[PDB]
Design an enzyme around this catalytic site. Sequence first.
Site, PDB file in Angstrom:
ATOM      1  N   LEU A  21       0.862  -1.200   0.000  1.00 17.60           N
ATOM      2  CA  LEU A  21       0.000   0.000   0.000  1.00 17.60           C
ATOM      3  C   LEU A  21       0.889   1.237   0.000  1.00 17.60           C
ATOM      4  O   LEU A  21       0.522   2.220  -0.616  1.00 17.60           O
ATOM      5  CB  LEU A  21      -0.913  -0.086   1.220  1.00 17.60           C
ATOM      6  CG  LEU A  21      -1.893  -1.258   1.201  1.00 17.60           C
ATOM      7  CD1 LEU A  21      -2.761  -1.276   2.443  1.00 17.60           C
ATOM      8  CD2 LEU A  21      -2.785  -1.218  -0.044  1.00 17.60           C
ATOM      9  N   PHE A  26       9.985   4.495   8.056  1.00 17.72           N
ATOM     10  CA  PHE A  26       9.688   3.476   9.095  1.00 17.72           C
ATOM     11  C   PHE A  26       9.772   2.056   8.521  1.00 17.72           C
ATOM     12  O   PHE A  26       9.890   1.121   9.309  1.00 17.72           O
ATOM     13  CB  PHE A  26       8.283   3.686   9.654  1.00 17.72           C
ATOM     14  CG  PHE A  26       7.164   3.636   8.638  1.00 17.72           C
ATOM     15  CD1 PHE A  26       6.786   2.441   8.049  1.00 17.72           C
ATOM     16  CD2 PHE A  26       6.465   4.794   8.294  1.00 17.72           C
ATOM     17  CE1 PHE A  26       5.759   2.403   7.121  1.00 17.72           C
ATOM     18  CE2 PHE A  26       5.415   4.754   7.390  1.00 17.72           C
ATOM     19  CZ  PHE A  26       5.072   3.557   6.792  1.00 17.72           C
ATOM     20  N   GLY A  27       9.567   1.902   7.209  1.00 17.42           N
ATOM     21  CA  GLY A  27       9.340   0.590   6.579  1.00 17.42           C
ATOM     22  C   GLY A  27       8.212   0.643   5.579  1.00 17.42           C
ATOM     23  O   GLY A  27       8.210   1.554   4.738  1.00 17.42           O
ATOM     24  N   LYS A  45       1.389  -2.399   9.025  1.00 19.86           N
ATOM     25  CA  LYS A  45       2.584  -1.543   8.930  1.00 19.86           C
ATOM     26  C   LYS A  45       3.724  -2.389   9.467  1.00 19.86           C
ATOM     27  O   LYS A  45       3.658  -2.784  10.621  1.00 19.86           O
ATOM     28  CB  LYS A  45       2.361  -0.250   9.714  1.00 19.86           C
ATOM     29  CG  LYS A  45       3.555   0.680   9.861  1.00 19.86           C
ATOM     30  CD  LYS A  45       3.246   1.916  10.688  1.00 19.86           C
ATOM     31  CE  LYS A  45       4.285   3.008  10.538  1.00 19.86           C
ATOM     32  NZ  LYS A  45       3.780   4.315  11.037  1.00 19.86           N
ATOM     33  N   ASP A 142       4.014  15.459  12.182  1.00 19.75           N
ATOM     34  CA  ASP A 142       4.376  14.911  10.849  1.00 19.75           C
ATOM     35  C   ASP A 142       3.155  14.903   9.954  1.00 19.75           C
ATOM     36  O   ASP A 142       2.942  13.918   9.213  1.00 19.75           O
ATOM     37  CB  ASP A 142       5.074  13.554  10.960  1.00 19.75           C
ATOM     38  CG  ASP A 142       5.781  13.178   9.660  1.00 19.75           C
ATOM     39  OD1 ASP A 142       6.358  14.075   9.015  1.00 19.75           O
ATOM     40  OD2 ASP A 142       5.663  12.015   9.277  1.00 19.75           O
TER      41      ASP A 142
HETATM   42  C1  LIG Z   1      -1.729   0.364  -4.229  1.00 14.63           C
HETATM   43  N1  LIG Z   1      -3.082   0.055  -4.738  1.00 14.63           N
HETATM   44  C2  LIG Z   1      -3.697   1.244  -5.331  1.00 14.63           C
HETATM   45  C3  LIG Z   1      -5.087   0.926  -5.862  1.00 14.63           C
HETATM   46  N2  LIG Z   1      -5.938   0.408  -4.780  1.00 14.63           N
HETATM   47  C4  LIG Z   1      -7.095   1.046  -4.461  1.00 14.63           C
HETATM   48  O1  LIG Z   1      -7.465   2.049  -5.044  1.00 14.63           O
HETATM   49  C5  LIG Z   1      -7.933   0.611  -3.242  1.00 14.63           C
HETATM   50  C6  LIG Z   1      -9.193   1.488  -3.131  1.00 14.63           C
HETATM   51  C7  LIG Z   1      -8.395  -0.853  -3.386  1.00 14.63           C
HETATM   52  C8  LIG Z   1      -7.031   0.914  -2.032  1.00 14.63           C
HETATM   53  C9  LIG Z   1      -6.091   1.939  -2.096  1.00 14.63           C
HETATM   54  C10 LIG Z   1      -5.294   2.253  -1.004  1.00 14.63           C
HETATM   55  C11 LIG Z   1      -5.407   1.545   0.182  1.00 14.63           C
HETATM   56  C12 LIG Z   1      -4.521   1.892   1.339  1.00 14.63           C
HETATM   57  O2  LIG Z   1      -3.377   2.316   1.171  1.00 14.63           O
HETATM   58  N3  LIG Z   1      -5.041   1.685   2.590  1.00 14.63           N
HETATM   59  C13 LIG Z   1      -4.380   1.920   3.794  1.00 14.63           C
HETATM   60  C14 LIG Z   1      -3.109   2.384   3.961  1.00 14.63           C
HETATM   61  N4  LIG Z   1      -2.964   2.512   5.310  1.00 14.63           N
HETATM   62  C15 LIG Z   1      -1.917   3.025   6.048  1.00 14.63           C
HETATM   63  C16 LIG Z   1      -2.033   3.210   7.386  1.00 14.63           C
HETATM   64  C17 LIG Z   1      -0.917   3.738   8.225  1.00 14.63           C
HETATM   65  C18 LIG Z   1       0.098   4.510   7.669  1.00 14.63           C
HETATM   66  C19 LIG Z   1       1.094   4.993   8.492  1.00 14.63           C
HETATM   67  N5  LIG Z   1       1.150   4.760   9.813  1.00 14.63           N
HETATM   68  C20 LIG Z   1       0.173   4.015  10.332  1.00 14.63           C
HETATM   69  C21 LIG Z   1      -0.874   3.493   9.591  1.00 14.63           C
HETATM   70  C22 LIG Z   1      -3.316   2.857   7.994  1.00 14.63           C
HETATM   71  C23 LIG Z   1      -4.338   2.340   7.282  1.00 14.63           C
HETATM   72  C24 LIG Z   1      -4.171   2.136   5.892  1.00 14.63           C
HETATM   73  N6  LIG Z   1      -5.034   1.736   4.966  1.00 14.63           N
HETATM   74  C25 LIG Z   1      -6.350   0.520   0.253  1.00 14.63           C
HETATM   75  C26 LIG Z   1      -7.151   0.215  -0.835  1.00 14.63           C
HETATM   76  C27 LIG Z   1      -5.322  -0.787  -4.184  1.00 14.63           C
HETATM   77  C28 LIG Z   1      -3.935  -0.453  -3.663  1.00 14.63           C
END
Ligand SMILES: CN1CCN(C(=O)C(C)(C)c2ccc(C(=O)Nc3cn4cc(-c5ccncc5)ccc4n3)cc2)CC1
Length: 335
Positions: A21, A26-27, A45, A142
């Site tokens: 994602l 951090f990674g 994460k 941040d």
């Molecule tokens: C790459 N592709 C792009 C195309 N896609 C999509 O359009 C969908 C809608 C299926 C999608 C997109 C992005 C996420 C996502 O990035 N979701 C997430 C990150 N994320 C990151 C923290 C987080 C951070 C930093 N520190 C702590 C937490 C928390 C929750 C969280 N949910 C999901 C679905 C599929 C994926």
Amino acid sequence: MHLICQSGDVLSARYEIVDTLGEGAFGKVVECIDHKAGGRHVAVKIVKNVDRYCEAARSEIQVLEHLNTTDPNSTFRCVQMLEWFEHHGHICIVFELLGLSTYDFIKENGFLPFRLDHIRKMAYQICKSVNFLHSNKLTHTDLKPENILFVQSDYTEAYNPKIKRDERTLINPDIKVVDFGSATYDDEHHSTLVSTRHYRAPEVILALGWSQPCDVWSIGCILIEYYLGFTVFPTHDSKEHLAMMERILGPLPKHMIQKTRKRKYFHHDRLDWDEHSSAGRYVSRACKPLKEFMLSQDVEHERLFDLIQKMLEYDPAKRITLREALKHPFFDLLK
Ligand SMILES: CN1CCN(C(=O)C(C)(C)c2ccc(C(=O)Nc3cn4cc(-c5ccncc5)ccc4n3)cc2)CC1
């Protein structure tokens, strides 16, 4: 890290990785099917196995336990942690799966700005969320478009063969705030450098001490970006950044210039800046007084820019608070 994220890998004998994602210092963050919660997709994460990132991740887990307990309904739109575990000596934090970061949404649309009605709704939710941190003796430190995520895939998208990419149209702009690895309690030790260069407050640059107001500055920079599609501080150099601030917001307060121990940036009581160098003429060319970035003179636009201007007050003691920001006329339309 490469060796413990790949599609198909199973973490904690339940979380099957299906995608990456995102990545930061951090990674990495991956999408997982949770075979022990009926196949619910989650975000995990995976933190680098490096002291400072391990400590930041234990700090993050601690902040999340506090915010998630305080606000169980996520009324204040902080991402919910489901649990955390260790995988080959990496801390893995499991989150509810959100959608795109506001950064990714803007970038992948060719740096096209958000609609003003969307910015209004997103600005309000961001202020409401970060003010909940501010109410609970936290500063995020941040805040940047990468750390604001859409809750839902409430958007459409079609391949446009003219520009050879997908265009994403936002339906619902509801967001949450993420990444509490840098979040600092009032009573804890304050790091000297905080925030990523483009969203860093002048009191941070000048090492004058910082707290909640440095979040407000960062939010100001985000709102600009949402409106134009790009930053007004596109720089990788602290002095140039200050030169850019001077062009956009006017001269720094003498009292901050004179107080700072970062005197390398200065000469007597002015920025040690050659305006007439080709770097200085670059700044003058690329940067203009804030209000000149306005795309419309329409009142809605004046309301946003007035909030932005108050958010980018140089003096953290004068800077608008988020409590105040939430009452600003720009948000009257929401009420
Ligand atoms: C790459 N592709 C792009 C195309 N896609 C999509 O359009 C969908 C809608 C299926 C999608 C997109 C992005 C996420 C996502 O990035 N979701 C997430 C990150 N994320 C990151 C923290 C987080 C951070 C930093 N520190 C702590 C937490 C928390 C929750 C969280 N949910 C999901 C679905 C599929 C994926």
